[PDB]
């Protein structure tokens, strides 16, 4: 390993802030996707946009992907994840069975929220 | 009659403190030095003669150093110079050779124009001899040790053999033209350069030497000579500074 890839094993405080922001943005995209479906269904029933937003009942999504993406167990929200899962991923060939999240290729884009329960 | 002037409080209200002493200072350096307690003499080496001891018959080489008009010119003190020394002049010289500026300097100190001038550092004021007092061979005592200081003989461009005692290369057994060379001069490409201080051909001589613990074996003023056992660096008619040995007594 002569070639030097000086990638540190820990993140700076600023990388952590950006990571938390990126997770929140993804959650907000999911939150907005459901909102549109609820509003569109309500308009189909006859309601208007305003009352749809103020409706007490919120129509939950029926698609498999959106239904699971709204489950905290499957896709936890940033305020729900643990600090370890925010910044550390699971690698089975590393001491501690964990490695820095920034070492995952395209970590900024890819989403890894869930780790095995005991790892 | 008060001129305008303004003062900033940043220094008007500042507390007063004395800076601590630092080693990089003439005061501390002077206290650390190893200096003798007596002034010295300027001598001209005239040659060398055998000294036959009349009690045991031992024959020891002795070099004759003459003293001629050795007079103290002026002093140097800690308060104005930072070190304690006695400037000493030797000999006499025609006014046509001495610079006009130097002729005035000698006159100010009421001394003759001098062949040579040198300083002999001392430990403290107690070793300062009054200016204008002539110095004689009797200033040194029989059987005491002194340190001599003179410029060595010139030798010109001298090779590695004569300069550092290199043993050169084999004189036979196939050796090529290079016999009187030092051989290697470095390592292969790791330093990529000849390290500083590498022993190398050059010029030796015309260099200051300090032979220490030279014994005085005859002091006489009727001939104006000083006898010191051994060799004194320099050629015929070379100025030599004699002073009390610091190491031995």
């Amino acid at each position: 390993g002569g070639l030097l890839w000086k990638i540190p094993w820990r993140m700076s405080t600023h990388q952590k802030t950006r990571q938390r922001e990126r997770l929140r943005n993804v959650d907000q995209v999911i939150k907005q996707l459901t909102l549109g479906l609820h509003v569109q269904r309500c308009q189909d029933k006859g309601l208007t946009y305003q009352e749809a937003m103020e409706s007490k009942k919120k129509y939950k999504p029926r698609s498999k992907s959106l239904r699971l993406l709204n489950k905290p167990s499957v896709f936890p929200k940033e305020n729900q994840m643990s600090s370890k899962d925010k910044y550390w991923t699971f690698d089975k060939k590393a001491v501690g069975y964990r490695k820095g999240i920034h070492k995952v290729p395209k970590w900024t884009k890819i989403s890894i929220r869930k780790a095995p329960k005991f790892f | 009659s008060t001129r305008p002037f303004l003062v900033a409080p940043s220094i008007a209200n500042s507390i007063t403190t004395e800076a601590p002493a630092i080693n990089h200072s003439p005061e501390l350096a002077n206290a650390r030095k190893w200096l003798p307690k007596r002034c010295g003499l300027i001598t001209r080496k005239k040659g060398m003669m055998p000294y036959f001891d009349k009690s045991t018959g031992e024959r020891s080489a002795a070099t004759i150093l003459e003293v001629n008009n050795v007079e103290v010119i002026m002093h140097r003190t800690s308060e104005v110079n930072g070190y304690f020394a006695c400037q000493v002049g030797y000999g006499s010289r025609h006014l046509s050779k001495v610079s006009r500026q130097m002729l005035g300097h000698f006159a100010s100190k009421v001394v003759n124009p001098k062949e040579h001038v040198a300083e002999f550092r001392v430990k403290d004021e107690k070793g300062l001899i009054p200016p204008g007092t002539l110095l004689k061979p009797s200033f040194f005592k029989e059987g005491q040790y002194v340190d001599v200081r003179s410029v060595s003989k010139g030798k010109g461009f001298t090779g590695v053999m004569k300069r550092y005692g290199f043993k050169g290369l084999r004189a036979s057994h196939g050796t090529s033209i290079m016999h009187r060379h030092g051989g290697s001069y470095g390592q292969n490409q790791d330093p990529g350069r000849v390290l500083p201080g590498r022993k190398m051909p050059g010029h030796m001589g015309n260099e200051h030497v300090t032979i220490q613990n030279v014994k005085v074996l005859k002091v006489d003023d009727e001939n104006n000579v000083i006898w010191v056992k051994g060799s004194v660096a320099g050629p015929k008619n070379s100025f030599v500074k004699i002073q009390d040995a610091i190491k031995k007594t």
């Binding site: - | 003062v7 900033a8 004395e18």
Partner: protein, 162 residues
Amino acid sequence: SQKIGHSGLAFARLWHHVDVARDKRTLGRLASAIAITLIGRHKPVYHPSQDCGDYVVVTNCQKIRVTGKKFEQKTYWSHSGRPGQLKLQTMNKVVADKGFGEILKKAVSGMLPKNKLRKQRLDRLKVFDGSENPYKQNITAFAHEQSSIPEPLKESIFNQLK
């Protein structure tokens, strides 16, 4: 339009004074502040192609503040060039040999940009261990701040020198 005018006063090498007895910053943080005023960033008329620095006078350096154990652990290096002649002097040795001003001067020298103006900017920094300096009158003084200074003290500082 803003540049037109008398620019002489702007490019004036004022003299600033920092008293380490009163200043509470550490060595490194103080050095950073001194570097900025020597570079000239504090001046709105500053350009990187010009040396707008201002002289800085530091007194009572002996009361410098060094945290941790650096005073006896920090090592200063100086290599002549020949192999095997590396010299490593602790901060304690350096101050005992040269003074506390050299610690500040060394710290500031690193902060200064590695340009041809580094040496000129460093000599503008005058560091004295004690309160006795020849630049007492070379400071920015104002008429409206002489009330606090008593007259007997004022006269001593001005006329009585050396």
